[PDB]
Amino acid sequence: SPMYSIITPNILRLESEETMVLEAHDAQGDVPVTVTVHDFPGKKLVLSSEKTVLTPATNHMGNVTFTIPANREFKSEKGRNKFVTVQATFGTQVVEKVVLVSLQSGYLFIQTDKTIYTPGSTVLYRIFTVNHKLLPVGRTVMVNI
Amino acid sequence: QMTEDAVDAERLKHLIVTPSGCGEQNMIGMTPTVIAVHYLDETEQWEKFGLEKRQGALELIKKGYTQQLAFRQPSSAFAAFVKRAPSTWLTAYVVKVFSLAVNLIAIDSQVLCGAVKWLILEKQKPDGVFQEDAPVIHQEMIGGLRNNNEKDMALTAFVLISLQEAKDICEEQVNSLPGSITKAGDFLEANYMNLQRSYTVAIAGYALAQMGRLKGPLLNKFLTTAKDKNRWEDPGKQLYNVEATSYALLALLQLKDFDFVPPVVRWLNEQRYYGGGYGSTQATFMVFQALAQYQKDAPDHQELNLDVSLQLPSRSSKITHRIHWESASLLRSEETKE
């Protein structure tokens, strides 16, 4: 009997390029998979959905790359943690995993032009907005002094 | 004032019950599992319970949903058998489970609206009275309706509740539903003073508290039958009184009253009822609907906002500041050189 396996990161990152490894051990022929990540306690809205066939040329292994969006106001509630449900339908056989999501969209590095400032002077500071892969993105930041 | 204790997630592990049997015993197998997943995903207490077990109930209640349509009669009715005469109570309670179950998985809606049209067309008199012919084999799930002095009041209030939460799905499908709602409400507003059992006052207060009118004498008699201002207690079994206090807390949450809610809350918390057992189906469904609605309405979407505007003679504008419960702008500092 074939075993259908999914491998995803332990936490997931909102608005970031996440990857899942989709395998079918001891399978035969093309196995068409559809992955769908929904919210966990509701399961009434699809956060993302992708489709990928599994060919025996790669010995039934593919990888599915999505970007799970940070919409639908599930981040506004700060109580406890947030989870998503990943259902991967390998043909007609579904597998299911509940993965934690982290409110994180990259890194911000603040560089000031000095280290000690005279009163009355001007602080010049750059903010470098990089993603999880350390590449430039365009986001909206809140700056407090 | 948001904070209160809830039912702990390790306490309620014994209500994962596999449904099996006839048209009533599988309903016994449904009801604490369905109300367990509903209370647990309203409380968001999966983290200290086990997330993958959430998937297990998601097929286990489907283990009843593949069964109960086999026990659906072809006249859009529900009975204990296919040759059994249908019940008003069993069809109303099937609709009461199934309209509570569509918030997680909905499959078919014509069974619910067809059963609602069955209780409107066959069991609703023009007086506004639902009547029970009683073909129910087991009296365990009937609860406080069983062995009650005013059976017609509590029965018609229960069927008005059972019609009323399925109104928002079968509004377009059933058009005669608000007429039967108005007839049942006009029956319920007549003999509210003639009740002497606080179970009937509690279930009629919930059936008249839902999206309509209740008068000063009606609300005053609903308030004054609360013994020690926290419980609706009658001679009989304790589960009937627990179901009465749960209907009373649902009534007090529906009327947006937050003063009489917390003594009923501490009385339900000190009762330590975790569900399960013999003859406990009504009690187990309404306790977790009561604190599931409390965990919906316990912040009550308060969201405290001060729209504080400071006007200066130094500048030509008044600057407003909207302090919300959102922590993006909690405190702000304004600097004035004059």
Swiss-Prot record, chain B:
Cross-link Isoglutamyl cysteine thioester (Cys-Gln), where in sequence: 22-25
Outcome following mutation: residue 54 to M: Impaired binding of C3d to CR2
Residues annotated with Phosphoserine modification: 333
Annotated site residues (Cleavage) in this chain: 315-316, 332-333
Effect ascribed to mutating residue 152 to A: No effect on binding of C3d to CR2
Superkingdom as given in the UniProt entry: Eukaryota
Disulfide cysteine pairs (residue numbers): 113-170
Outcome of substituting residue 127 to N: In AHUS5; leads to impaired binding to the regulator CD46/MCP and resistance to cleavage by factor I
Effect of residue 41 to A: Minor effect on binding of C3d to CR2
Effect on the protein upon substituting residue 127 to A: No effect on binding of C3d to CR2
Residues annotated as transmembrane: none
Quaternary structure and interacting proteins, as annotated: Interacts with CFH. Interacts with CR2.
Name of this protein: Complement C3d fragment
Organism: Homo sapiens
Gene: C3
Boundaries of the shown chain within the full protein: 989 to 1326 of 1663
